[PDB]
Amino acid sequence: SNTQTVLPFTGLNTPSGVAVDSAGTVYVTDHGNNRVVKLAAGSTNQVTLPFTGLNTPHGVAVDSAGTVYVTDHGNNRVVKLAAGSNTQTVLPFTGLNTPSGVAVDSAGTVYVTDHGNNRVVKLAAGSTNQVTLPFTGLNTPHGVAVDSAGTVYVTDHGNNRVVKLAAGSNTQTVLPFTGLNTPSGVAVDSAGTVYVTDHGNNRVVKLAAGSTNQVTLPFTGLNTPHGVAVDSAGTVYVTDHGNNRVVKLAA
């Protein structure tokens, strides 16, 4: 549909990452304010999550237990916070250089786009064994998403492309998006449809699984969209750091 709502967040300064959970709570990294905020479905009351020490936080993800993960790229680290907790945990990633995106699968594995090092890395839940995923020839990989089957999707914007890698595969596929210019956020729905913020064209596009028929989502008044997320009903959420807002569009 074209049913668009601006969510009632307040005081945002360059929102960047966005994620939505199974309850419809929307999480946003307020990049210029070094904080992560949330709004429950239908709520009017934005809440700041109790992270501390962030410097340009960027990607955000939320697992099935409500633990929130944030890439803190100024500090080359990934931080998590269990729902309701006041102690944040710095995950044991090593050698990150400006990490931009984070995703978490149903087993709790955490995937990070290590933007400055041209790689995607992961940690299984509770492990210190960082593993590099066998993508090929990435160049400033930026956004990352993981679907219910463990396929990992990456905006490989230094190569102006979106790639995907099935769980256990050693051979990535390049998705046939049309007309991209430097993609940033990526998200994937329960049907495997892939949503991408085509940042250099100020638009959000989608491609159903295995399809070549790209659709531009009918948002109106987008200025500089950046991050994208999609909920279990197919509603799409986009951060716009040109006008400091978060917009949602029903399916």
Residues forming the site for Zn ion (CB under 5 A): 56, 58, 142, 184, 226
Q: Which residue number, 58 or 164, has a Cβ lying nearer to Zn ion?
A: 58
Minimal distance, residue 159 CB to Zn ion, in Å = 12
In 3D space, the residue among 138, 98, 107 whose CA is nearest the CA of residue 120 turns out to be 138
Q: Which residue number, 159 or 193, has a Cβ lying nearer to Zn ion?
A: 159
Q: Which residue number, 226 or 248, has a Cβ lying nearer to Zn ion?
A: 226
Minimal distance, residue 148 CB to Zn ion, in Å = 23
Minimal distance, residue 113 CB to Zn ion, in Å = 8
Minimal distance, residue 120 CB to Zn ion, in Å = 13
Q: Which residue number, 88 or 184, has a Cβ lying nearer to Zn ion?
A: 184
- Confirm if 46 and 38 have CB atoms less than 8 A apart: yes
CA distance 160 to 132: 21
Q: Which residue number, 55 or 190, has a Cβ lying nearer to Zn ion?
A: 55
Minimal distance, residue 31 CB to Zn ion, in Å = 5
